[PDB]
Amino acid sequence: APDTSVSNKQNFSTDVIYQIFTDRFSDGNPANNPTGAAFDGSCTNLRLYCGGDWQGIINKINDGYLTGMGITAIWISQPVENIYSVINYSGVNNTAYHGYWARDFKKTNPAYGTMQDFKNLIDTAHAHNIKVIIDFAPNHTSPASSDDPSFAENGRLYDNGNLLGGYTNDTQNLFHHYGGTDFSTIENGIYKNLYDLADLNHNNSSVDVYLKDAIKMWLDLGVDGIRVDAVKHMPFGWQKSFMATINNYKPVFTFGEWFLGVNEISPEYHQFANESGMSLLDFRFAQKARQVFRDNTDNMYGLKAMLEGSEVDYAQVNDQVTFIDNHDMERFHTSNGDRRKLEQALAFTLTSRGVPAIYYGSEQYMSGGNDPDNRARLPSFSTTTTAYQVIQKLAPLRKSNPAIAYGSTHERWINNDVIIYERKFGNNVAVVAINRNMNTPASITGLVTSLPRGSYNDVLGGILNGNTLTVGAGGAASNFTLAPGGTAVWQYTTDATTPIIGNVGPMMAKPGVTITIDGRGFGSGKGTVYFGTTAVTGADIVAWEDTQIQVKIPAVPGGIYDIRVANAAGAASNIYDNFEVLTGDQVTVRFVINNATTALGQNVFLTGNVSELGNWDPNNAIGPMYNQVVYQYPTWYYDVSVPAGQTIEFKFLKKQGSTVTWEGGANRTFTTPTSGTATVNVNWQP
Ligand SMILES: [Ca+2]
Ligand SMILES: [Ca+2]
């Protein structure tokens, strides 16, 4: 099927996502509304249920509100049954309207709809070429106090109606009991509770298996993507085995939320997007876009540097989900803010690299501060706002112009208030000019583009004061004045003759799994796919057409490979690197080592004989290990994803700067479980 098909669950760069808080969008079924203290039909107490549900989203797909705007994916609240309690937090009553306070991951939240209503949403969305992404929040259940078992539902977890356990008297240790996090360290935010939420214990085999069985159920119901909540607050090692479960079963686009503030760049955040098997909400993009287009705390050179630097820091930048606001930020549009600021930021996001997400009601110019004020009911379903028309015009270009879906980004002209960038993929081009100064026109002289000669009409039709671009010989444009607040988009598409890979999904899986390679110029006839120097041809290529190849991963050693395609004529593509072939199915094992004393700056790491443990290379060793919450120094511990059902060999080592101290003695061996978790508890061997 083509790369733009709704059946492409692996890659979303050709899509535009509309993020919906289900409760705040449309009440299509009043009979499923909560009653009593849990409900507020006027939606003026923003912490109660207002009534929005899955029938309301079905109605807005059917009547053309969502499809008229060019939306091709919706991202909805977690679908799972939540606690029914109205919790009073110092006078204010609070309900689970947001879907984050789960009690049974195998059932539906009835305020949103039945399981038949969820299937009707999936089938209605897919009949209209809309993909469905769901939130999934496996870090916790709901508010709980083990001291007071009567508070809320005591964090209880059920498995399809059957109670597994509560937070008080947790004799099976389904939950963590280390107190609440102060967010001082990543280790501290993982194993301690976020606020009062009962933290799930993923080292318990019952919890591990239950959450993996629950996500497969939702994949079986046909969801096309998953947004994982609180990825900074769960063990990396457990999240990599969770991703391997999804990818080796039914791979779908998965991304997580790791918040970053203004000007914060975190190595760990980049490491997680590059190695977990999931991508991330692009906070680095969002925060700089708000600084340049909203708050005016940086200028176009800051925008340029973010686009140039993130193309490099993210190993797969086309998989990062971009946005200008969402449920964890104040709405971009302010009361005294020019609406043109919101319209340009949306045009910038829709034509930029990655997977664009628009927070519901942006097209209706909703303003509001932080939670819960950024989650009001949307006030109007008017299809004639300028912002609705901007999305309507630009969102289709992700499906039709591969330079917007996959292309590189090149700044062609800039000054403090103007940027003109080009997106390029093969011979497909898009050029975008934006002037954020609302008072001053900009004289553009010397603009050179990759556009063929012609008179290109603004795709926005002049609604944000854009103009025609006349391109002469050698891509040189005739000089023009860019209007105050002007934004224009010019483009040119054609066929690729050379294979060019724009995106691959999933990026981590074991041998035998089918991966999806998207791009242009592959040809109709079946060619060759290279994983390193290994050629995959013939029947192992499940499908080949010009924009998409589906191929089985060859039985190669675990490790990281470059992918390259050669069409039937032997013309080869660009390399798409960093593909991780796993040794096999994964399980998370907790490694615990006692009596490992260290100097300042020296930490303990683990390596071993499989790719998942870095294949004996100290530079790729797992760590640094933790030593504060579950176990305390000089005992160190870490949860590591490791191949299931086999004997691995390993050693611990201490590293400080460039010095590696290996423990002495013979290599350690351990036979891993086939499912569930395991703990290895050993003593440092001098
Ligand atoms: Ca309802
Ligand atoms: Ca946690």
UniProtKB/Swiss-Prot annotation:
Residues 407-495 are annotated as: C. One of its GO terms (biological process) is carbohydrate metabolic process. Substrate binds at residues 100-101, 140, 193-196, 227, 232-233, 327, 371, 375. Residues 1-138 are annotated as: A1. Residues 496-582 are annotated as: D. One of its GO terms (molecular function) is alpha-amylase activity. This is Cyclomaltodextrin glucanotransferase. Residues 583-686 are annotated as: E. Ca(2+) 1 binds at residues 27, 29, 32-33, 51, 53. Monomer. Residues 203-406 are annotated as: A2. It is an enzyme of class 2 (transferase). Binds 2 calcium ions per subunit. Residues 139-202 are annotated as: B.
